C-alpha cells in the first residue's frame, strides 16, 4: 500500500504530506509480511520483531526485511554528502539497525559494508511521551552511496533501498536526508 509523495519540497523525505513518500518494501525483500504507513507524518514500519526482520548485527541486515522507495518519483543531488540520517521514533526506547544503498541512473547497486545500529540508551524521551535517536549511514558504511556522491557526473540518487531490523513491533522514521 505504498503511496507516492505529493510534497517533496523540503528535499528530503520528511512524510508530512500523508504518504509513505514512496516507500514500500523492496520485491527482493527476504520478508514481506511488513506493514509500511504514514502515521502521524513519519514512515511506520510495524511487526519487525513478530516477523523475524529482528538481526541487529553489522553484517547480517541481509536477514531483514528490504524497503525501497520504488514510486519515489523524485531525486536529490548528493555530490559532495558524506552522511545519511534519520530520526528513529518508538513508543519506548528501542534497539534499530539499518542498512542502506541509494541508488542513481547510472549506480544501481552496492553491497552496504556494514549497518548501524541505534541501541535503548541512545533514546531520548520526547515531549510527548515518545522516544527518539538519530541514526547516522556515512558514505564510509555505505559503497554505493560513496560511488554516487563523488561522481560529479551522476551524483543524483532516484531510489534507496532500507534494510531494517528491530526488536519493536513498532517503530518510525523520519527525516531521512542527506547532508556533509
Ligand atoms: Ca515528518
Excluded at 140 to 147: A, L
Aim: hydrophobic residues 35%.
Amino acid at each position: 500500500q505504498p503511496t507516492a509523495p505529493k510534497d517533496f519540497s523540503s528535499g528530503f523525505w520528511d512524510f508530512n504530506d500523508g504518504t509513505t513518500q514512496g516507500f514500500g518494501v523492496n520485491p527482493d525483500s527476504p520478508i514481506t509480511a511488513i506493514n509500511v504507513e504514514n502515521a502521524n507524518n513519519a514512515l511506520k514500519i510495524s511487526n519487525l520483531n513478530s516477523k523475524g526482520s529482528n538481526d541487529l548485527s553489522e553484517g547480517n541486515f541481509w536477514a531483514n526485511v528490504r524497503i525501497s522507495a520504488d514510486i519515489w518519483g523524485q531525486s536529490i543531488n548528493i555530490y559532495g554528502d558524506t552522511k545519511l540520517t534519520m530520526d528513529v521514533i518508538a513508543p519506548t526506547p528501542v534497539n534499530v539497525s539499518i542498512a542502506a544503498i541509494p541508488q542513481s541512473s547510472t549506480h544501481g547497486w552496492g553491497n552496504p559494508t556494514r549497518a548501524i545500529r541505534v541501541w535503548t540508551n541512545n533514546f531520548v524521551a520526547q515531549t510527548d511521551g515518545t522516544y527518539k535517536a538519530t541514526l547516522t549511514i556515512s558514505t564510509n558504511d555505505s559503497p554505493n552511496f560513496n560511488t554516487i556522491a563523488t561522481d560529479a557526473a551522476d551524483s543524483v540518487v532516484t531510489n534507496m533501498i532500507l534494510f531494517v531490523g528491530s526488536n519493536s513491533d513498532n517503530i518510525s522514521l523520519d527525516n531521512i536526508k542527506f547532508t556533509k
